[PDB]
Swiss-Prot record, chains A, F, G, H, J, L, N, P:
Protein name: Light-harvesting protein B-870 alpha chain
UniProt keyword annotations, A-Z: Antenna complex, Bacteriochlorophyll, Cell inner membrane, Cell membrane, Chlorophyll, Chromophore, Formylation, Light-harvesting polypeptide, Magnesium, Membrane, Metal-binding, Transmembrane, Transmembrane helix
Listed GO MF terms: bacteriochlorophyll binding; electron transporter, transferring electrons within the cyclic electron transport pathway of photosynthesis activity; metal ion binding
Organism for this UniProt entry: Rhodospirillum rubrum
Family under the similarity heading: Belongs to the antenna complex alpha subunit family.
Lineage: superkingdom: Bacteria
Chain ranges on the Periplasmic side, renumbered to this chain: 33-45
Segments traversing the membrane: 12-32
Localisation per UniProt entry: Cell inner membrane
From Swiss-Prot, chains C, I, K, M, O:
Full protein segment contained here: 10 to 53 of 54
Membrane topology classification: Single-pass type II membrane protein
Protein function: Antenna complexes are light-harvesting systems, which transfer the excitation energy to the reaction centers.
Binding positions (a bacteriochlorophyll): 10, 28
Regions of this protein lying in the Periplasmic compartment: 35-44
Organism the protein comes from: Rhodospirillum rubrum
Gene Ontology molecular-function annotations: bacteriochlorophyll binding; electron transporter, transferring electrons within the cyclic electron transport pathway of photosynthesis activity; metal ion binding
Protein name: Light-harvesting protein B-870 beta chain
UniProtKB/Swiss-Prot annotation, chain E:
An annotated GO BP: photosynthetic electron transport in photosystem II
Presence of the UniProt keyword Metal-binding in the record: yes
Residues noted as binding Fe cation in the record, renumbered to the chain: 190, 230
GO molecular function: bacteriochlorophyll binding; electron transporter, transferring electrons within the cyclic electron transport pathway of photosynthesis activity; metal ion binding
GO CC terms in record: plasma membrane light-harvesting complex; plasma membrane-derived chromatophore membrane
Gene3D superfamilies, per database record: Photosystem II protein D1-like
Name the UniProt record assigns to this protein: Reaction center protein L chain
Domain of life: Bacteria
Lineage of the organism: Bacteria, Pseudomonadati, Pseudomonadota, Alphaproteobacteria, Rhodospirillales
Length: 45, 259, 44, 255, 274, 45, 45, 45, 44, 45, 44, 45, 44, 45, 44, 45
């Protein structure tokens, strides 16, 4: 109830899920854009 | 005035403000912080995208990194504004037609800025931030990829832009003509058909053989406006990725005689 | 909306966020074993 | 061989033809939406449902959609409610495309530019449920901008210089803020008041009286303006009737 | 065939010229004297366009082209095999457009509504005339009008815009582009708002002007109104066409140099000229 | 003679006159376009 | 606690979180756009 | 004969006239565009 | 549509269409005598 | 015979006429475009 | 409408479509005699 | 057989006919675009 | 809309679709005899 | 089977048919774009 | 939609989807027999 | 199970289906873009 007294539960859940998905997608894209951590091309270390 | 921002509006404004500040600071630094030179060359100033050798990664700040940061922040701001105009329509218990029409412009913006560079592997041919720089990007894009006049989806985008202008010149003129009969109360006419809507439909029927309704003319307008940017985005995506020379494509497909 | 509903929501939220963070920590540990992401003085 | 699908077909052409298919479907849908008012087509002479149509008539007319109103009533589109076949006019020729000639006074008979749609006998309502269009007496809160000239007290004149009366009230719109109608006290038969659309009235600028000129009808036509049942509210049907009567002046004023 | 509400409006009168002769309908089309003239000019021009296509090298619709006479001909009428056909088609098209506008005027008179629609079509007619008559006349030859072809008029547009180095730098052309983009944006916004008010979602009640104003006030900060939006859209489209006409009049009749080079005056201003 | 019972005489006459005038103009323009039958230019046979 | 009588806690928290997240994202991007501090494409010091 | 019970004679006649005229004009133009069947240029066989 | 009038229209239409088809056939015969439009194996 | 209790005979005839005319026009245009079956140009076999 | 009129229309439709298909088949036979449209292994 | 209670037979038949004609036209054009299956051009196999 | 009419329509539709599929299969067999459309290991 | 209480069977079938047809068309066009599985051109393995 | 209507629709839907999936599996097996789409270590 | 009191099950199912299909399509297109995992081309390792 500490933080759910104010914020709507459904809105908080939807916003958190969307933000987490967008952040994960951005981090994965950034990793794919690097030579070392691109697991698809798999260049040498 | 009574602008409702909310959480999504605050986010979008912060992101867009950061992007605008980055772009403006880069433009002012390009003239060595001269207000006089900034005023002199404001149109010619631009923030260019990174070169092709950097790929989709983070280029150095002085070599396109600022462009990448500003572009990402602007894209996030625009997407959050789309979310805002979706949520405002939902809150007012109204339809999301405005959000889904803005989605087409966002699609074109992403195709020009992010999606096509993602397909091509680098940000070299992305649109720089500047009036004359982006005009020159337009010119050089068309010149490099054959002739954009010969792009069929560019043809369609131009046709739908002319159609949007034509449809608004028809609709505004018609509503002003029937404004003395209560035609400006369009939703009231939709809910209870009146002599204004009847006379507008009859005028267009007697003119060109067929007519619309007070709601379906707005459907026509919405679809024309959306299809302009949608077909244009499709043409931008297909340019270079699958067709390297639009003039040669037109020659192959009979649009022009073979040189 | 009410006190009991808020208590249930907080309990389930705590459980779900703990599962999410545990899975994320496991994935990060696996990625670190595969290839660390902190370069040394000479690099990678 | 970059974008080639076959020897001659390629990806750009395939996407173009996909868009052509989608656009044909979209035109079908848009015409379907166009046919939500006034359809099916009736015969010009007999009035029976009959028209030259093809195999697309199955898809031509969509199922009636329901508009939910804040008053609890519903409006269906298409409603299939046709006007009466018989009207107070006679064709000049027996052909279907021949025009109609009014039998008597077209302005009163409501044919041609004087014709109006049989709208609901209910005034437009604001968000709060109160009638949208009321005289300024019933709405003390609203006022005319100080930068503009109050039409109240200004003489009403026609295109020939004949004075029809004086403005005694203004009818405003509470939903969309604007002036809709002018209440004019006729010079002839004192005490009789007629409604006057605002959109059909231009102010004559510097005339030392700013006479509210009505180019639609002449002075003698003001006595035949349709009346309204209530003194503080106007229904949609009466509204249309008044606007239609005023709009027919350009064609039937000199007749 | 008639609509459910057309018989009471299909009345006599309203013709500008011709009287009762042409006051009749053929199907949904109102004929009128100017409609008869429109059909005359349309048939003549279409037949001559097909004749030019037959005279041409290909029957492909994209490659069909009717070309104006050579610049060497000046303003003199050319032989029919050397641009005279283009001139005849041009003037027949002008007649067809004028007759269409006057037919719209007759329909407006019959229905007792305003003439805003023919007035707005007059701007399209004026743009076409400026492109095929006014600009070549002030330029000194009929050869500067665009050829009547699906692709060759686009090639004319490209060549004319590259004659001045870069047409993107034409100051009136920038304003025309701005107004053309704004007309599409405003059309999208207006259609979207009207459709969102009429269709507020399943299980919801139709909204009104209050909600329409409140939505755009809340989102962007301000609104225009119910008729202000239509007036703004009409003015935007007509201003885009007018500024396009102005840029085309400037490009070649008045200004013959490079539009990118025209912008040096901004960099030569006294408060920045270093 | 029943074609006049089918079509109004004045409207039919006006439409036929317009059609015939358009046809004559089109054929004359075609002849002018051709080289053999351009009587104004008068090219040799 | 005087500050929270003037500023609404919900609005203050929402604004502060947005600003902090945007600032952190910008700083991380700036670091990624530098040769020395790019951890995903690490080079020599 | 029942075909005229199904269709309006006047509309049928007008539509047939317009369609046949347009078709004949198109066929004549197509002939005029060919080398063999252009009777106005008279190319030899 | 009255049967008598429809049959009168048919009796006029049949004669008119037969005359039109006969004129077209005569014109086509003359055109074929002038230059046939069916090429042989070697063309024209 | 049961199909005409589904579809209006007049609308079926009009649709058939339009569809057949357009299809025949398209096929004739394709044949004219081809070299073997262009009877007007008469290319050799 | 009613099966009587429907069957009359079906009879007339069947006769007309049979005539149409016979004309089309005769035309196609003549076109095939002129130039067949099915190439062999080596083409035409 | 309940599919015909779910769907209007008339609408289903018109939609199916339009879909089949468009699909057949698309496949025919695809075959014409091929060298092997172009019966009009007749390229050797 | 009803049950008997739906069953009649289903019967006629099944017969018509069977005829259509038989004709299509016969045409496909003819086209396969002319030129098969499944390449081998070495192509055509 | 309660998914059919959740969703209208008619709309579900229409949308599913549209989605499946579009997916199949996309997959076929992708196969045509590839060289190994282009059955019309039949490139060697 | 009543429970019996939903159950009947579910039964017919299950039958149709299994027929569809069986046909698709047969087609994919034929395509695999023609040319497999899973490359080996050395490609195709 | 209270998450289904928070969210409409029909909307949740529709959104999940759309999101999952879009994600699967995106991942498949990414794999097609990559050289190692393009099963249609089969580049050797
Ligand atoms: C050599 C130059 C050349 C050339 C000869 C020629 C010809 C012509 N063309 Mg073309 N064109 C050329 C090149 C070319 N052409 C364009 C496009 C078009 C369009 C734009 C449509 C639109 O609404 O854009 C406009 C929409 C956009 C770009 C997207 C909307 C943007 C949004 C929502 C973002 C919101 C913004 C903010 C929050 C503010 C952020 C702040 C900061 C950055 C500081 C269109 C309809 C059109 C018109 C004409 C005509 C009429 C002609 C004539 C008469 O010659 N052309 C292409 C496209 O796909 O358009 C969709 C495209 O990208 C491209 C290129 C490179
Ligand atoms: C070495 C490089 C590498 C590598 C080879 C590789 C592969 C791939 N990765 Mg990645 N990844 C790598 C590294 C790595 N990766 C991640 C994670 C992930 C995630 C995050 C999911 C997410 O954002 O959910 C975010 C969603 C949440 C948290 C939803 C929770 C729900 C909430 C709040 C409330 C519920 C309300 C709603 C949903 C609203 C609607 C209502 C209803 C439906 C009822 C995940 C499932 C995932 C998938 C893949 C894919 C598709 C690929 C492909 C094809 O390449 N990756 C891990 C994580 O977060 O696990 C929880 C993590 O820590 C970590 C690391 C280190
Ligand atoms: C070097 C190449 C280049 C270049 C880099 C660049 C860039 C861009 N430009 Mg430009 N342009 C270039 C070339 C160039 N530019 C144009 C014109 C414009 C316009 C006018 C639009 C208008 O108002 O049309 C107004 C339209 C007319 C002419 C209306 C006439 C129509 C009539 C009476 C009705 C006809 C009716 C029938 C026949 C009947 C039909 C029957 C049935 C359907 C049954 C305009 C706003 C515009 C658009 C863009 C953009 C958005 C871009 C982008 C995306 O960069 N350009 C000028 C013009 O036409 O001005 C009147 C002109 O001639 C000219 C030139 C030479
Ligand atoms: C259908 C295609 C057409 C179209 C449609 C279209 N555009 C649209 C819409 C639609 C339907 C909208 O609903 C949306 C809109 O709101 O319109 C009014 C929009 C829109 N398209 C726009 C413009 C636009 N449209 C264009 C064209 C088109 N869009 C096409 C012609 C074009 C071009 C190039 O022709 C442009 C430039 C915008 C006006 C608007 C989208 C606004 C947006 O996304 O804004 C993002 C937010 C920001 C940049 C934030 C700025 C913040 C400021 C710096 C203020 C300060 C804030 C604060 C101080 C920050 C906090 C500071 C602290 C952190 C320290
Ligand atoms: C001025 C604001 C916009 C506008 C408004 C506008 N247009 C209008 C109207 C209005 C208000 C009408 O009322 C009227 C109408 O009824 O539309 C349905 C119309 C109209 N504008 C039209 C088209 C159109 N408008 C355009 C633009 C615009 N018109 C502006 C953007 C454009 C372009 C290029 O952007 C086009 C293509 C038509 C739909 C219609 C015109 C109807 C008409 O003129 O009918 C009479 C003529 C014919 C039926 C055929 C005449 C054929 C000629 C004999 C030959 C002409 C050949 C031509 C010169 C070249 C052709 C080849 C090209 C490829 C170059
Ligand atoms: C308030 O909301 C509003 C609505 O409403 C409620 C609306 O609806 C609309 C209107 C908008 C829409 C309906 C949406 C669609 C509009 C667009 C997308 C804009 C684009 C428009 C088009 C692409 C259509 C263009 C079509 C045209 C221009 C019509 C063409 C017409 C002709 C060529 C013929 C004109 C008719 C004449 C002159 C007479 C009739 C002719 C015939 C029937 C054929 C010939 C007849 C005969 C042979 C017999 C008679 C012959 C005579 C008299 C002799 C002539 C001699 C010769 C042979 C030449 C708006 C704006 C509105 O805001
Ligand atoms: C039934 O009817 C309906 C209504 O009614 C009930 C309506 O209402 C509307 C809604 C329509 C309108 C309210 C206006 C429609 C008219 C046009 C589109 C043409 C006029 C164009 C504009 C004025 C642009 C307006 C667009 C806005 C305000 C978008 C808002 C976006 C943000 C707040 C995000 C941040 C803003 C940014 C980044 C820029 C936004 C653009 C501008 C504010 C204008 C551009 C300004 C500059 C970049 C520099 C200029 C600076 C200014 C103006 C300040 C200094 C002063 C100067 C003069 C220079 C419709 C459609 C409708 O159907
Ligand atoms: C009312 O309730 C009833 C009674 C109905 C009961 C219902 C209960 C329900 C429905 C409970 C549901 C609970 C659930 C599903 C809870 C889910 C919780 C989760 C998944 C929580 C996760 C939270 C994650 C957080 C807060 C993460 C924050 C991380 C941040 C802000 C990191 C930012 C990083 C930055 C800026 C840096 C990025 C670096 C670069 C730029 C390099 O990366 C791209
Ligand atoms: C009602 O009240 C109760 C009782 C409830 C009590 C409430 C108490 C509260 C809420 C108290 C809160 C107090 C707080 C948070 C106070 C914070 C104060 C701060 C941080 C003040 C800071 C002020 C800073 C100022 C004024 C700085 C001015 C600097 C200027 C103008 C510098 C300009 C520099 C220029 C133009 C030069 C630039 C150089 C470059 C290089 C940038 O130029 C190109
Ligand atoms: C109620 O009626 C009363 C009592 C008054 C009696 C009146 C009766 C009357 C007047 C009856 C009239 C009957 C008539 C006139 C009947 C006519 C029937 C005809 C001619 C029917 C024709 C049917 C033809 C069909 C269905 C043909 C279909 C062909 C198709 C779909 C072929 C498509 C081809 C494709 C897709 C491929 C083309 C190849 C290319 C090369 C174009 O591909 C790119
Ligand atoms: C108070 O401070 C003031 C306001 C005075 C500062 C002044 C600011 C000024 C003057 C700002 C504006 C300047 C000008 C002249 C702006 C003009 C802008 C124009 C006309 C831009 C036109 C087109 C640009 C486009 C279409 C670019 C789109 C770019 C996109 C979508 C880029 C996206 C990039 C992404 C998603 C990057 C991804 C890579 C990441 C970061 C994820 O990893 C490397
Ligand atoms: Fe309506």
């Amino acid at each position: 109830w500490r933080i759910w007294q104010l914020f709507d539960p459904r809105q908080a859940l939807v916003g958190l899920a969307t933000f987490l998905f967008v952040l994960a997608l951005l981090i994965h894209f950034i990793l794919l854009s690097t030579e070392r951590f691109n697991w698809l091309e798999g260049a040498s270390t | 005035g009574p602008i409702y921002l909310g959480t999504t509006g605050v986010l979008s404004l912060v992101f867009g403000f950061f992007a605008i500040e980055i772009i403006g600071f880069n433009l002012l630094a390009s003239v060595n912080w001269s207000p006089m030179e900034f005023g002199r060359q404001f149109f010619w100033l631009g923030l260019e995208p990174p070169a092709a050798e950097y790929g989709l990664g983070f280029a150095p700040l002085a070599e396109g990194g600022w462009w990448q940061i500003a572009g990402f922040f602007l894209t996030t701001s625009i997407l959050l504004w789309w979310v805002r105009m979706y949520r405002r329509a939902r809150a007012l218990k109204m339809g999301t037609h405005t959000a889904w029409a803005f989605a087409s412009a966002i699609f074109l913006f992403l195709s020009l800025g992010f999606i096509r560079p993602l397909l091509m592997g680098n940000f070299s041919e992305s649109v720089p931030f500047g009036i004359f720089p982006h005009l020159e990007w337009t010119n050089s894009f068309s010149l490099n990829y054959g002739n954009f006049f010969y792009n069929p989806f560019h043809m369609l985008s131009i046709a739908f832009l002319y159609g949007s202008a034509l449809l608004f010149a028809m609709h505004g003129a018609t509503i002003l003509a029937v404004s003395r009969l209560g035609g400006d109360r369009e939703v009231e006419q939709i809910t209870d058909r009146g002599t204004a809507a009847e006379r507008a439909a009859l005028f267009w029927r007697w003119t060109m053989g067929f007519n619309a309704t007070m709601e379906s003319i707005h459907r026509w307008a919405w679809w024309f406006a959306v299809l302009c940017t949608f077909t244009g985005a499709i043409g931008i995506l297909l340019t270079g990725t699958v067709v390297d020379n639009w003039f040669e494509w037109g020659v192959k497909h009979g649009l022009a005689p073979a040189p | 909306i009410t006190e009991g509903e808020a208590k249930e929501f907080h309990k389930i939220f705590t459980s779900s966020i703990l599962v999410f963070f545990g899975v994320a920590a496991f994935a990060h540990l696996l990625v670190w074993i595969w290839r660390p992401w902190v370069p040394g003085p000479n690099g990678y | 061989n970059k974008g080639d699908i076959t020897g001659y077909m390629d990806v750009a052409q395939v996407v173009l033809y996909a868009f052509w298919i989608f656009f044909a479907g979209l035109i079908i849908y848009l015409r379907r939406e166009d046919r939500r008012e006034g359809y099916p087509l009736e015969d010009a002479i007999s009035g029976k449902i009959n028209s030259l149509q093809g195999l697309g008539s199955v898809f031509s007319i969509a199922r009636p959609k329901i508009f939910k109103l804040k008053t609890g009533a519903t409006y269906a589109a298409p409603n299939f409610k046709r006007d009466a076949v018989a009207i107070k006019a006679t064709r000049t020729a027996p052909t279907a495309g021949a025009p109609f000639e009014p039998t008597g006074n077209p302005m009163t008979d409501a044919v041609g530019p004087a014709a109006y749609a049989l709208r609901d006998e209910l005034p437009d309502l604001t968000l709060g449920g109160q009638p949208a269009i009321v005289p300024l007496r019933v709405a003390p809160t609203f006022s005319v901008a100080a930068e503009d000239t109050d039409p109240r007290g200004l003489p009403v004149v026609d295109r020939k210089g004949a004075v029809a009366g004086k403005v005694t009230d203004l009818w405003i719109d509470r939903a969309s803020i604007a002036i809709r109608y002018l209440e004019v006290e006729l010079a002839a038969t004192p005490g009789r008041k007629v409604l006057l659309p605002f959109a059909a009235t231009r102010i004559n600028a510097k005339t030392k009286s700013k006479t509210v000129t009505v180019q639609s009808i002449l002075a003698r036509h003001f006595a035949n303006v349709p009346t309204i049942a209530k003194t503080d509210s106007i229904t949609r049907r009466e509204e249309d009737k008044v606007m239609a009567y005023y709009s027919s002046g350009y064609l039937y004023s000199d007749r | 065939a008639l609509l459910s509400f057309e018989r009471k409006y299909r009345v006599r009168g309203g013709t500008l010229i011709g009287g009762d002769l042409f006051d009749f309908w053929v199907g949904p089309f109102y004929v009128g004297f100017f409609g008869v003239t429109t059909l005359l000019f349309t048939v003549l021009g279409t037949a001559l366009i097909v004749w030019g296509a037959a005279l041409g090298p290909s029957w492909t619709f994209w490659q069909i082209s009717i070309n104006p006479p050579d610049v060497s001909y000046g303003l003199a009428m050319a032989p029919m095999a050397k641009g005279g056909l283009w001139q005849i088609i041009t003037f027949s098209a002008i007649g067809a457009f004028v007759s269409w506008a006057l037919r719209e005027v007759e329909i407006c008179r019959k229905l007792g509504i305003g003439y805003h629609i023919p007035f707005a079509f007059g701007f399209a007619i004026l743009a076409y005339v400026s492109l095929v008559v006014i600009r070549p006349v002030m330029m000194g030859a009929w050869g500067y009008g665009f050829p009547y072809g699906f692709m060759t008029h686009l090639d004319w547009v490209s060549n004319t815009g590259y004659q001045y180095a870069n047409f993107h730098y034409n100051p009136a052309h920038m304003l025309g582009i701005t107004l053309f983009f704004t007309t599409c944006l405003a059309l999208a916004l207006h259609g979207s708002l009207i459709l969102s008010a009429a269709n507020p979602g399943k299980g919801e009640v139709v909204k009104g002007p209050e909600h329409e104003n409140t939505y755009f006030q809340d989102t962007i900060g301000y609104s225009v109104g119910t008729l202000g939006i239509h007036r703004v859209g009409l003015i935007l489209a007509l201003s885009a066409v007018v500024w396009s006409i102005i840029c085309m009049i400037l490009s070649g009749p008045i200004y013959t140099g490079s539009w990118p080079d025209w912008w040096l005056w901004w960099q030569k201003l006294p408060f920045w000229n270093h």
